[PDB]
Design a protein around this ligand. Sequence first.
Ligand SMILES: [Ca+2]
Ligand SMILES: [Ca+2]
Ligand SMILES: [Ca+2]
Ligand SMILES: [Ca+2]
Ligand SMILES: [Ca+2]
Ligand SMILES: [Ca+2]
Ligand SMILES: [Ca+2]
Lengths: 203, 209, 208, 211, 210, 211, 208, 211, 211
Amino acid sequence: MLLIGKPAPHFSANAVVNGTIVPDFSLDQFKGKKYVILFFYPKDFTFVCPTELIGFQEALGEFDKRDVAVVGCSTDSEFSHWAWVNTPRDQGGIQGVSYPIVSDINKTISADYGVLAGDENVEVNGELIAYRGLFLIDKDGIVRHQLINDFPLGRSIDEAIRVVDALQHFELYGEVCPLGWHKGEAAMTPSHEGVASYLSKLE
Amino acid sequence: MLLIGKPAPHFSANAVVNGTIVPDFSLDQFKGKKYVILFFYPKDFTFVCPTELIGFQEALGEFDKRDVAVVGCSTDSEFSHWAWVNTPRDQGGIQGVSYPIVSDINKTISADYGVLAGDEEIDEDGNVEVNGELIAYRGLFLIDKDGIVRHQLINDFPLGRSIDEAIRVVDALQHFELYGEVCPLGWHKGEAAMTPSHEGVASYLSKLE
Amino acid sequence: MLLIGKPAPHFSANAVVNGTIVPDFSLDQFKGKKYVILFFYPKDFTFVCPTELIGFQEALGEFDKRDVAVVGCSTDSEFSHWAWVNTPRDQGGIQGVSYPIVSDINKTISADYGVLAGDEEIDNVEVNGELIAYRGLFLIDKDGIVRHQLINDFPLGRSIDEAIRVVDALQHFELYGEVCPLGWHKGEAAMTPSHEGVASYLSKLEHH
Amino acid sequence: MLLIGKPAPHFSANAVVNGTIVPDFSLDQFKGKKYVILFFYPKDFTFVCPTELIGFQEALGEFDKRDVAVVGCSTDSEFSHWAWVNTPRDQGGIQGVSYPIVSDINKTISADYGVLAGDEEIDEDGNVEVNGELIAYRGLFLIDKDGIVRHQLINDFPLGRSIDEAIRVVDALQHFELYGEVCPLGWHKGEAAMTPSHEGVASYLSKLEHH
Amino acid sequence: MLLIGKPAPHFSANAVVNGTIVPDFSLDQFKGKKYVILFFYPKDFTFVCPTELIGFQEALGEFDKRDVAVVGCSTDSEFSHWAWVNTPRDQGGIQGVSYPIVSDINKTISADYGVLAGDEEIDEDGNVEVNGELIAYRGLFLIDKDGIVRHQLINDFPLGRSIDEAIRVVDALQHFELYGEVCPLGWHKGEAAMTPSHEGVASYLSKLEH
Amino acid sequence: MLLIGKPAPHFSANAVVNGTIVPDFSLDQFKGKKYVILFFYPKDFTFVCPTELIGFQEALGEFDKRDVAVVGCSTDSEFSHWAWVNTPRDQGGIQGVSYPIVSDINKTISADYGVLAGDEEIDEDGNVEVNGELIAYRGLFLIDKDGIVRHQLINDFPLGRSIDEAIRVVDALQHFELYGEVCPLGWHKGEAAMTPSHEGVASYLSKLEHH
Amino acid sequence: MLLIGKPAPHFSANAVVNGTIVPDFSLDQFKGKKYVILFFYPKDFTFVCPTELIGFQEALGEFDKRDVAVVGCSTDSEFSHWAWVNTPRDQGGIQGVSYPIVSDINKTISADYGVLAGDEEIDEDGNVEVNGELIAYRGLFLIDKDGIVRHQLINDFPLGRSIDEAIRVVDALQHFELYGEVCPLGWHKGEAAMTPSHEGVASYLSKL
Amino acid sequence: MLLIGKPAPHFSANAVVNGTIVPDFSLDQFKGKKYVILFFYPKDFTFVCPTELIGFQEALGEFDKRDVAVVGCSTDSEFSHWAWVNTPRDQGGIQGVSYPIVSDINKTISADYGVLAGDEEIDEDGNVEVNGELIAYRGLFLIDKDGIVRHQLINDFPLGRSIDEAIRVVDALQHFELYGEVCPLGWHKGEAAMTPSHEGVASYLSKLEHH
Amino acid sequence: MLLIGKPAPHFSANAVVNGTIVPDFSLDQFKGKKYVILFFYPKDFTFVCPTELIGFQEALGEFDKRDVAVVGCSTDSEFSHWAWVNTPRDQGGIQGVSYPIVSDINKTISADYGVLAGDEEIDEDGNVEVNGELIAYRGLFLIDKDGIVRHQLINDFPLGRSIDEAIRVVDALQHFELYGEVCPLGWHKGEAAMTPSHEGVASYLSKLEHH
Ligand SMILES: [Ca+2]
Ligand SMILES: [Ca+2]
Ligand SMILES: [Ca+2]
Ligand SMILES: [Ca+2]
Ligand SMILES: [Ca+2]
Ligand SMILES: [Ca+2]
Ligand SMILES: [Ca+2]
């Protein structure tokens, strides 16, 4: 489903924050204060998912500098999350992951964000688990960027950081970010003069 | 909607291929033969859109080497596309863009791929009213040789995309197809992949330590 | 659609006025002030459409003297319009067209005015043909009421003369209460809408 | 209704042809043989309508030479039509009009062609009330030999139509059918048409800047 | 539909009154003042209809003396009516007909009175297809001064009506209104009516035996 | 209901024929053989109804000569009908009435012919409420040999009908059937009818004006 | 339908009371004052029906002494009833029947009491066809002073009813109302009733 | 429900026959062979019900002589019935009742025969609530050998029924079946019946008048 | 019916309490005062049901000590219940059963508690037919002092229940209510419970691994 330009759907669920189970976790707390990178993964105790979670843990300071809160989510229970953060990495665990890991135990968050796999007396084709979904949410709670990958295709922290940098650049300077833009490169004024001037300089 | 794991919706529209208007363009031709990178942009003759189109033209060799066809799409007419490829780049044009640029003139492609902006309503006697513009967001899809969507990405209007990220996802999909190894976070071609098993993930994570 | 005797459907869209993109263009501004000749064409950068747009530009004074605003419209974007008015005529452009060219980007204007081509069928929703505007033209009086409409197939260009003639007939009926007979032109004899009026008008045809 | 590019709706009704009442008149007979100019008017024995009908009768040869059948229609009965063609013109009649005048006595033809005036409403108990008069506006349709509508025009009650514009649209349609050239704004038979191509439109528009 | 004992449906249409087109004609004007004989015929410029209209014109005084307004109606336009009253009788016209002739141009009046011929059906493309002609049968209604229908009659197209029967029904209605006696079969003004009671019917039928 | 041009609704009920109760009486028996004058009255043992029934008995020969079967009907039972034909006329009875008197005991015939009085409603508790009496008004129908209704008439309760008008309408129907001439206003057997054509009506009206 | 324990449906119709046609006859008048024996019969001028009506007339005193109003009803008109009470008994008439005979001219009373014979079938358009005759079967109802039905009985057309059974049920109802004793099988006025309790039924059955 | 003239609804339930619980009891077995008197009572182990059941046992021979099978029914289980027939009469039991006593444990029989008390209603909460007790009133049905209901009677809870009235109605039905004579008011076996004709009723009432 | 965590459905019915028929029995009276063990059985005068009812009578003191009211229920009438408590046990009776035995005579309680056996289906005649018997399975519910169902059990007809398991679940619920410790598998009063926490479950299981 299309959430670009729309408010990130509200939820309130159990989560693991700093390795501790906490109730009533919501993205409300970040409105007006932090951007949010919210990412969904399919299953605790699997393969690409721990590497993605651990990598987000390693880059957590880079998101902190940018006023970005990192939030993970799967449809597993908060107790599976807790068991997993208490499993050492050399045993496949995600020990040391300290940002919030939301438990979408009813699958309503994954459904509302349009990342729930499977197809639906009531019978279900496939597994109702989340694909590798990622959303960039601005300080107003609006979705500005989304990405969904199939199960075997891990995501990239560099691209998430790049889109964060681009959004903040557009918010600061009103300049739109052209293809392949990175922090420090030339942006563009959104006008006829702007596009003619930017494209002439490239050639 | 959610197209991951599902066939990319079929279409058949006018397009500009190698600067020429052609009819009945479809992604059918690529089934069993090429991967497809399909990207939607909002409007001809604008700002971020020409930079994305030109950059895809410049990187076309990287996609050719990987058996990937690049296809652009907007809801503008095929003639607006043709005028745009016949406009020099220093005037905001996209001259030299040679891959197909599809005209989603009926907006059905953008709807089917879930990238169409705007909201529609039915009033008391107001028929269909639309809030906002029915144009495509900066949407991108990776379609494998069977026509299945394996990756999708949508950016708001002012956020241009990245060719490197598209190439990386192509490499990850092709690596998983060849070796059955899943690609971990931040993976690039030539780096260590992973065996999808308990021992595989445990051993992979031990090497990082 | 049947719009004669009914208000022209309201709209508010981006347009190019005097070669510049402007937002929130509507026919509201003309209610009580000007008549409107509103014409739809299918596609920017095509064939008959530039000749019609340029010709409406050349005859623009004939409409000004009659308190008629000329407004064109297609389902192309306002940026396509802007690119087209910046293309020289010898290359197929419509450079110098200065009256408002509305962008019906959502196709709701053409739908509401009954000029949108194509057929919509549900299976998703599939469309047979192209959802673009036919060569449609509407005369709207100062109260916002449609008094004349005409739609031509894609290859059949319209005529400025017939538009001016219908405008003259409407204004003559508004002024004198006389109905305009077949082939009436400004300055020719009209008719009083009564038994005596039609008998007298037709008798003179058999006297001269 | 939007009929451009679509078949002209079928009908079969009483008419006055050559001053005589005949049944089962339809435009089927013209498919593959003649173009049709079909025009609706609101009321027999009124004001603009006799001038339009008489003018079409006098210009009938111009349509005959172009393989065009002229057919008129209103929702009055065939007997009103018959009485009207037996009324001398100097008293408001349409004597001498010999082409078919269709009686749309049930108003289904006018409704199908999208020219029927009035507004239809249902009551709090289910009765059918009508605001205004269910009569035809000044509607005109050009139907090609395949029965497809290529041009349509509707005028308010006091605004008579123009035979010149009807002939011009016929000539433009026939020129496009014969030569595949599209007819630009204000085109008349014998003037330069246009090739529907990038080069064609560029060539046409460049020549206008000099001529 | 059955209108006996129910109000005559309201309408407001163009009509030709005394040979002149007038708008907003209604039977409301007659409420509390006059009875109404309202008759529908199918088509202007035809065959039985001019004879019925002319005959009503010739008998107009018999209805005036009885405080009865005569109103004709068809689904033709008011201009067809006007042309018809300006056509001489020796050419099939109805010249000299001066009472109101209503134009039921939308066919709603004929529908409301249940005299409209033809059959309407909606096809699966939305449009309405019609078998036959939506024109009025030869319908006649007697409406009292309260606007209530007391007598109705419908004839097929080739069967002209009878002025005598209309006058007889008017006289019977007025006699019952005045004296409260019910009118037996074949009753005419001046003949013996009947008291609506056991004794009344026994007495009336006894006298008929001689 | 509008029955002109439509088949008279079928029924099959008990009746009194020649003073005898008989079952399964229907107008089917007359199809192809006789016209039918079918008349409804409200109640046995009342006031106008016996005068109408007796008068139809007195004129029975006039209808026999014209191949017309006379049939009466009310929503009373066949036993009330039978008792009534066994009550002498000087006591309010209809002794001597010999044509069929149908018992519309279920009120379905009166409903089908559009002559049933009264108003039905559904009450609070889904009950069925009736305003007035579900009895037949003074309804009369002329049915031709094909079973099609050609003339219908309904009178309020206190207004007795007229045998002369029924016979006149019968003569008009039979004249149109025999000669194809339409019968003008006030036409009676032996007078001039009319050819349904322009010339026919013009000729008929000319003869009246100097007559 | 089951009316036992529920109010007898209200009605208001023409009737013949003491040989005279009267309007607006209803059982409301008896509420709080009299019991009602209400009986339906199929057709005036038939066979069992006159014997039942005459017998109810002859037994009228037994109902009067028990504060019971007798009311007959059929779907025939009030004038048919009046003609029938003016017919001598030796010719099949019901001369001398003086209690109210209701005219259920609309058949709504017979429907509301569930005694109307026949079957109604309805189609899409609503055309109502009927199998059989919509006339009342030989129905009888005992209504208490509150308007509550306490006993009902319906017989097929050829099976006449019994005055003794109606009077017996009246006696049983009045006995239960007065003494709170339930009436066993075959109970008659003056015979032993029963206390509605374990001991009451055990003691009653022991004596047999 | 109105069952007169209609087939007695079919059922198949457990019953106590001659003091023994048996399955699949139905009235089908009696079709074409015996009349049926089927009676419903509300509750086992109560007050009027044992007297009715015991009295029907005592009169069983009178019904046998008339080819009548007696069947009782309540919505109690077959085991309550069995316990009750094993309870001595001097303790309120129905020991010695040997004809079939049906267990309408699903209440469907009492519903089908229109003798079930109580009212069922559905809420907005979707639940089913019941006003009163869903038990059978004192209902009685006479079923002929073809399975058609010819007589029915329902009494309020405190009003016991009458064996005499059942016998009398049985005799009347059998008399009408044999002789085609209808039974007048108060008729008993051996008394004068009536021929269903005008003459029959006229003659019968005359003998009552003078004598 | 999943009632765990939801209020026990309300009812108000006739019952036998201490061998006496009483009206308007409800579990309302126990809210805030007593726990409720509510058990359904299929039929009076059968086989497993008397053993269960008598066994609950014998264990009544064990429930009294725990502030638990024992209530039985079947769809039999209150009079069948009364007869059954007046039958000696050596004849299959339940003499001496003094706690409330509810009569679910309308079957609404069994339906609301999800223990009603049988299958209902509506005929084409809108009629309701039932496959099987609408009787209660061997259902048991533990209801807390707030009226909330905390434990439920349903057995097929031939499988009698266990007093020990009912007492055990009562003890487990009361232990959790008093001390907030959850009761592990097979817990009995006096044995070690568990703190619902990570450390609590780890510590509980550590002690088991030794013993
Ligand atoms: Ca879900
Ligand atoms: Ca669309
Ligand atoms: Ca649209
Ligand atoms: Ca219509
Ligand atoms: Ca009916
Ligand atoms: Ca039930
Ligand atoms: Ca139930």
